[PDB]
């Protein structure tokens, strides 16, 4: 019914949850599982590097957002639209979107608000898919993501 949304949510939710808890989800992927698995391998390799390369800026933005509760987490959609959607789209910026999401997910675990991680992943997915579908489709979706970051 909306295959790109469903697959995006699975990849994003899995990465954020795994980043927060330190444990891999053992459940099978849904449809397009082969691609989703490679997308997840790519985020672990690339997204983890991004959180370190931008550590000071990431810690700074986190502090500025001052996330304490569910209402603070709900406020993030507006900021993501402002910063991510209102700019050039490329894979790098999409990785920063998702990687900073993981950064926030880990924060939510530290403040014992782990229940907000899946809603956060839904919000990120809404921003990504619902504001950049045209670009994502043209760039071959998650297959394109995997191809873009491929290690020979
Ligand atoms: C060179 C650039 C990366 C480094 C920039 C870091 C910035 O200082 C802040 C640290 C977090 C980033 C702001 N923001 C983080 C935002 C905006 C802040 C709220 C938020 C919340 C969640 Cl859950 C996820 C993302 C975000 C929106 O997503 C992006 C996407 C691309 C770039 C920036 C960005 C963004 O600017 N990406 S980029 O690759 O062009």
CA–centroid distance, 83 to ligand 1, in Å, is 7
Residue 103 contacts residue 62 (beta carbons within 8 Å): yes
Largest Cα–Cα distance of the chain, in whole Å? 44
For domain 1-149, which CATH number applies: 3.90.228.20, 3.10.310.30, 1.10.437.10, 1.10.3720.10? Answer: 1.10.437.10
Residue in 47, 73, 40 with CA at minimum distance from that of residue 146: 40
Residue in 89, 142, 113 with CA at minimum distance from that of residue 127: 89
Q: Give the residue before each break in the chain, using a C-to-N cut-off of over 2.5 angstroms; say none if it is continuous.
A: none
Residue 113 contacts residue 73 (beta carbons within 8 Å): yes
Residue 97 contacts residue 80 (beta carbons within 8 Å): yes
CA–centroid distance, 28 to ligand 1, in Å, is 30
For a substitution probing ligand 1, which of 53, 73, 84 has the most ligand atoms within 8 Å of its CB?
84
DSSP state of 66: T
> Using a 6 Å CB cutoff, which residues line ligand 1?
54, 57-58, 61, 76, 79-80, 83-84, 92-93, 96-97, 100-101, 104, 120, 124
Q: CA torsion angle for 116, 80, 128, 55 (degrees, to 10)?
A: -80
CA 59 to chain centre: 17
The method recorded for this entry reads: X-ray
The CA distance from 9 to 15, in Å, is: 10
Domain boundaries, the chain: 1-149
Contacts of 115 (CB under 8 A, 6+ apart): none
Residue 89 contacts residue 134 (beta carbons within 8 Å): no
The CA distance from 31 to 1, in Å, is: 12
Residue 41 contacts residue 144 (beta carbons within 8 Å): no
The CA distance from 103 to 55, in Å, is: 9
- Dihedral sign for Cα 91, 83, 47, 23, please: negative
CA–centroid distance, 54 to ligand 1, in Å, is 10
Q: Where are the alpha helices (DSSP H) in 22-140?
A: 33-53, 55-65, 70-74, 76-80, 91-110, 117-138
């Amino acid at each position: 019914e909306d295959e790109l949304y469903r697959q995006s949510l699975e990849i994003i939710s899995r990465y954020l949850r795994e980043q927060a808890t330190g444990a891999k989800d053992t459940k099978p992927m849904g449809r397009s599982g082969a691609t989703s698995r490679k997308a997840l391998e790519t985020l672990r390799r690339v997204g983890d590097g991004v959180q370190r390369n931008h550590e000071t800026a990431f810690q700074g933005m986190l502090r500025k957002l001052d996330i304490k509760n569910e209402d603070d987490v709900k406020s993030l959609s507006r900021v993501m639209i402002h910063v991510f959607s209102d700019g050039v789209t490329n894979w790098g910026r999409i990785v920063t979107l998702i990687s900073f999401g993981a950064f926030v997910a880990k924060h939510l675990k530290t403040i014992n608000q782990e229940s907000c991680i899946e809603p956060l992943a839904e919000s990120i997915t809404d921003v990504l898919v619902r504001t950049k579908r045209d670009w994502l489709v043209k760039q071959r979706g998650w297959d394109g993501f995997v191809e873009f970051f491929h290690v020979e």
